[PDB]
Design a protein around this ligand. Structure first.
Ligand SMILES: *[C@@H]1O[C@H](CO)[C@@H](O)[C@H](O)[C@H]1NC(C)=O
Lengths: 44, 49
C-alpha cells in the first residue's frame, strides 16, 4: 500500500554510466495499481 | 419539517444553547498515521545509557 518514487536529475538514445537514485516521497496511500499512462505538453 | 430554536439570554439551564463536538476514530488499513505527541528526554553523552 506504499507508493514509492525514486528520482534524480543529472545534466549531460541514452548514454552509458552508473548513478544511484535516492528516495523522493513516502506516500501511505493504499492504492492498487495495474495500469498507468503518461501526460505530454502539446504544441499549440 | 424545520423549526428553529430561540435562545434569549433569559432562559434557564436546559434551554440555553449548548455547543457539542464529537470525535470519532477509525483505523481502516493504514500502516501508520497521526499518533500522540512524543515526550523527549534530552540526551547525555560519554555515559553508558
Ligand atoms: C489489490 O488487489 C488485490 C487483488 O488483486 C486485492 O486482494 C487487494 O485487497 C487489493 N489491495 C487494496 C489495498 O485494495
Amino acid at each position: 500500500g506504499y507508493f514509492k518514487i525514486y528520482s534524480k536529475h543529472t545534466p549531460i538514445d541514452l548514454p552509458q554510466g552508473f548513478s544511484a537514485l535516492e528516495p523522493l516521497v513516502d506516500l501511505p496511500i493504499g492504492i492498487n495499481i495495474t495500469r498507468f499512462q503518461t501526460l505530454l505538453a502539446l504544441h499549440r | 419539517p424545520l423549526r428553529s430554536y430561540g435562545f434569549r439570554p433569559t432562559y434557564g439551564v436546559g434551554h440555553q444553547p449548548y455547543r457539542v463536538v464529537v470525535l470519532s476514530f477509525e483505523l481502516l488499513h493504514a500502516p501508520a498515521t497521526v499518533c500522540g505527541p512524543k515526550k523527549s528526554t534530552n540526551l547525555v553523552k560519554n555515559k553508558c545509557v
